[PDB]
Amino acid sequence: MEKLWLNSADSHVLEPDDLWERALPAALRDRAPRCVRDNGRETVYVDGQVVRRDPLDFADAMRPPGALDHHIRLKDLDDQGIWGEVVFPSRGLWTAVMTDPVLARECIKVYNDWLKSDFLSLSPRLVGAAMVSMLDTDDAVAELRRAADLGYQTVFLAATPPPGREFNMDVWEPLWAAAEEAGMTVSIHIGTGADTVVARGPGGAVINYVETLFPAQRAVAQLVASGALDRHPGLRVLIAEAGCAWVPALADRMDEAYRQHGMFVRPKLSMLPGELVRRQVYASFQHDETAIGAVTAMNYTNVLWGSDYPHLEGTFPRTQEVVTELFAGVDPEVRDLITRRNFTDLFTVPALPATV
């Protein structure tokens, strides 16, 4: 009771520099994501493409020792008063901008085996997101099925899929089925599948942070409007790291178009966009007070807190100071929904007593 015990729907693991070096067949090794550290600069390379350049200050700001040592991660969880934590890739996210299905498939296979055998094995508190090919449905289905057998509870998809593979297209249907069948949550994490540095004028850093929402919103719109959620009532989707309050907003906007633009709408839905969102679309946030508002005043109950451990955008190391001010004066049942119960609906971890 001397801490508020949280479940985090969002965090990242830094992969071993040599993950793909050691594990891939030799024909693919050089093409895997690798990095050069020189001057103040870390340049990431993927399959003959510079994909990212950061200064070492910011690169290493996201690299506290818990981001590397999984034994320190757990000590940081305890320290933050965090129990459950979903873990998303860092380096493996660049699989989502690969143009070669074979390279992407094999890199993903390597990541999924490492994450389960060398990280998730340390504690049942850690729930892992398995990657699945953004490029080929048969590769993604095969990997999700293989990941389920291994006991994975959720797959990661990039917010921006490859060209012609928008989330409303038929190509995704076999994956939505497999995911529904397997009981498996689809986690779409923002800032992935495309270049995140879109704006370069005055206000660039705030503009770009905003630009990452558009694919998230687009993704919900494509999954609702296409009927994908409607055909798969068991399929539940987590928009991770997008904030929350835009989700009921978008529920209203798709309802207006469904009702007033009825005559141009294809396909028809068994219920309204708003109902599909409120049933099956979850979303995570770190600091956003609007996230409570969406629950109390907009009937959007699918809100989950996340540390985004250990990015700057996240709460670490001030998790307790942050959640304490957010939920200062807030109904205990809503603090519990947002911080604990929505998590345990999506993900299985050992149950804290809700009594303590």
Ligand X SMILES: C=C1C[C@]23CC[C@H]1C[C@H]2[C@]1(C)CCC[C@@](C)(C(=O)SCCNC(=O)CCNC(=O)[C@H](O)C(C)(C)COP(=O)(O)O)[C@H]1C[C@H]3O
- Binding to its own copies in span 28-57, by CB under 8 A: 55, 57
CA distance 184 to 213: 24
Task: Count Cβ neighbours within 10 Å for each residue of 220-254 and write b for 16 or more, e otherwise.
Answer: bbbbbbbbbbbebeebbbbbbbbbbbbbbebbeeb
Q: Based on CB atoms, which residue is closest to ligand X, 18 or 264? A: 264
- What DSSP assignment string belongs to 21-72? HHHS-HHHHTTS-EEEEETTEEEEE-SS-EEEEEEHHHHHHT--GGGT-HHH
φ/ψ of 109, rounded to 5, equals -50, -45
Q: In the complex, which residue's CB is closest to Mn ion?
A: 311
Among 213, 211, 223, residue whose Cα is nearest residue 176: 223
User: Is residue 163 part of the contact set for its own copies (CB under 8 A)?
Assistant: no
Smallest separation, CB 337 to its own copies (Å): 15
Pick one of 209, 231, 293, 344: the residue that binds ligand X (CB under 6 A): 209
Q: Is 268 helix (H, G, I), strand (E, B) or coil?
A: coil
User: Is residue 264 part of the contact set for ligand X (CB under 6 A)?
Assistant: yes
User: Is residue 206 part of the contact set for its own copies (CB under 8 A)?
Assistant: yes
CA distance 291 to 243: 7
- Binding to its own copies in span 126-155, by CB under 8 A: none
Q: Based on CB atoms, which residue is closest to Mn ion, 95 or 226? A: 95
User: Is residue 291 part of the contact set for ligand X (CB under 6 A)?
Assistant: no
CA distance 293 to 135: 38
Q: In the complex, which residue's CB is closest to ligand X?
A: 191
Q: Measured on CA atoms in the order 73, 242, 282, 334, is the torsion positive or negative?
A: positive
Among 130, 129, 136, residue whose Cα is nearest residue 98: 136
Angle CA(66)–CA(157)–CA(221) in degrees, nearest 5? 125
Smallest separation, CB 225 to ligand X (Å): 10
User: Is residue 215 part of the contact set for ligand X (CB under 6 A)?
Assistant: no
- Binding to ligand X in span 86-115, by CB under 6 A: 90, 93
User: Is residue 304 part of the contact set for its own copies (CB under 8 A)?
Assistant: no
Q: Which does 38 bind (CB under 5 to 8 A by kind): ligand X, Mn ion, its own copies, none?
A: Mn ion
| Strands, E assignment, the chain | 6-8, 34-38, 41-45, 50-55, 82-87, 126-131, 154-158, 185-189, 237-240, 281-285, 303-305
User: Is residue 190 part of the contact set for ligand X (CB under 6 A)?
Assistant: yes
User: Is residue 205 part of the contact set for ligand X (CB under 6 A)?
Assistant: yes
Pick one of 42, 79, 118, 313: the residue that binds ligand X (CB under 6 A): 313
Smallest separation, CB 300 to its own copies (Å): 9
Query: Are the C-beta atoms of 132 and 142 separated by less than 8 Å?
Result: no
User: Is residue 195 part of the contact set for its own copies (CB under 8 A)?
Assistant: no
Q: Which does 203 bind (CB under 5 to 8 A by kind): its own copies, ligand X, Mn ion, none?
A: its own copies
Q: Which residues are annotated as a binding site for Mn(2+)?
A: 10, 12, 38, 189, 241, 260, 308, 311-314
Q: Based on CB atoms, which residue is closest to Mn ion, 103 or 132? A: 132
Of 5-13, 23-31, 71-79, 280-288, which part binds its own copies (CB under 8 A)? 280-288
* Cα 303 from chain centre: 14
Binding mask 39-78 for ligand X (x = CB under 6 A): -------------x--------------------------
Query: Are the C-beta atoms of 153 and 347 separated by less than 8 Å?
Result: yes
CA distance 316 to 116: 24
User: Is residue 263 part of the contact set for ligand X (CB under 6 A)?
Assistant: no
Residues of this chain that bind Mn ion (CB under 5 A): 10, 38, 241, 308, 311, 313
